[PDB]
């Protein structure tokens, strides 16, 4: 998240690309926007513990209770996975990923 | 640098040693809802005295 982008092409970096225990850093060219939220209205209460120290915790939830989630566009994410597949099939030729 | 910055920022804050006690937790969310991950835990905290 929030990184620097590649210049013109998706760049696939790994130590070997044949050892299966090596993490592949895929570097995109176009960023994909994610929107993350926790929608339930939460509160805060302070519980005094010892001299001069407090402890902040959840006191109550006001309103209805909904689901914390994140939203990505499906078309853009499909296009990004397809372009990563384009750049990745030339390192694993004549194969389906 | 990230590890040491995290530790030296987290050093002078409140330590939660007196809170590790026996918790009585019944229920917080009314029904299953979306995810009933809340839990209403009560305990015997220590005051200034």
């Amino acid at each position, epitope marked *: 998240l929030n990184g620097s982008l590649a210049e013109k092409e998706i760049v696939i970096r790994s130590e070997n690309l044949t050892n299966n225990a090596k993490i592949i850093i895929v570097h995109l060219h176009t960023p994909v926007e994610i929107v993350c939220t926790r929608p339930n*209205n939460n509160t805060r209460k302070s519980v005094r513990i010892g001299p001069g120290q407090t402890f902040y915790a959840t006191g109550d939830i006001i*309103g*209805d*209770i*909904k689901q914390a989630h994140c939203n990505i566009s499906e078309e853009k994410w499909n296009d990004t996975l397809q372009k990563v597949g384009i750049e990745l099939q030339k390192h694993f030729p004549n194969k389906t990923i | 640098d990230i590890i040491s910055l995290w530790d030296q920022s987290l050093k002078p804050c409140v330590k939660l040693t007196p809170l590790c006690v026996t918790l009585i937790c019944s229920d917080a*969310t*009314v*029904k299953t*809802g979306t995810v009933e991950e809340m839990k209403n835990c009560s305990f015997n905290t220590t005051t200034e005295i």
Partner: antibody
Framework: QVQLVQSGAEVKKPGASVKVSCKASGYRFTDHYIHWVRQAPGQGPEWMGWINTSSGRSNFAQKFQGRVTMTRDTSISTAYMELNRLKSDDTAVYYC????????????????????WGQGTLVTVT | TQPASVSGSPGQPITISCTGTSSDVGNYDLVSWYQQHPGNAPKYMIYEVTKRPAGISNRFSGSKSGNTASLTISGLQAEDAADYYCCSYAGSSTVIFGGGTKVTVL
């Protein structure tokens, strides 16, 4: 066309409890919020509470706490309003209204989109 | 807050206002208008700050300025003498009303 059926008149002495039923027809009971509106005669209406019909979570007004409970049954698709310790000022018309769309991702409970109103009931405290 | 009553001749627009606080109308644009004939359930023709549901013509139009919301009725007819109430979201998932405006169509 959807329609909400409400109960008949309730005549009783002060100090007792009143249950008001609201039965929905024509649409799914689980899909929409149910709000309650109390209107005294010669007086404008007043919102009194909402219920989530999917999980039974309900909230009331700032001064109806401790006197009001709200239940529902999704099998026969109805909601119940229980009011305890009535007084002579509780003589009013009670309305079951259909609110916003129940969604799993955002809080649309407080939206005052009262689409369909029931026929209401009259509660007279003598 | 709401004016007690308004009066007007047929064929001309009128305005009914509702002045709330910053938390009621200023923070959230959730305002609505409901007319009510006597001896009947309240109607429903405004739900958002300006929108209208199906089956309602362009007689009524909502607007919001600052901390108040005004409903403009473009022309007056004999059935337009009902009691009008404004309504809004207010604070901690609660809903408040206006109180009432009686329209006197001449």
């Amino acid at each position: 066309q959807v329609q909400l059926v409400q109960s008949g008149a309730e005549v009783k002495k002060p100090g007792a409890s009143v249950k008001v039923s609201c039965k929905a027809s024509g649409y799914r009971f689980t899909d929409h919020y149910i709000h309650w509106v109390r209107q005294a005669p010669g007086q404008g209406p007043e919102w009194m509470g909402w219920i989530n019909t999917s999980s039974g979570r309900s909230n009331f007004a700032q001064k109806f706490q401790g006197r009001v409970t709200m239940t529902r049954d999704t099998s026969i698709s109805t909601a119940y309003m229980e009011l305890n310790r009535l007084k002579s000022d509780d003589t009013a018309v009670y309305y079951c209204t259909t609110g916003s769309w129940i969604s799993l991702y955002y809080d649309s409970s407080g939206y005052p989109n009262f689409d369909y109103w029931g026929q209401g009931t009259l509660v007279t405290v003598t | 807050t709401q004016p007690a009553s308004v009066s007007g001749s047929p064929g001309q627009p009128i305005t009914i206002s509702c002045t709330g606080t910053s938390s009621d109308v200023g923070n959230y644009d959730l305002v609505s208008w409901y007319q009510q004939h006597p001896g009947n359930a309240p109607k429903y023709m405004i739900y958002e700050v300006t929108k209208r549901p199906a089956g309602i013509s362009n007689r009524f139009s909502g607007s919001k300025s600052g901390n108040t919301a005004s409903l403009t009725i473009s022309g007056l007819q004999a059935e337009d003498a009902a009691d009008y109430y404004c309504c809004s979201y207010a604070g901690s998932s609660t809903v408040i009303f206006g109180g009432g405006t009686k329209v006197t169509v001449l």
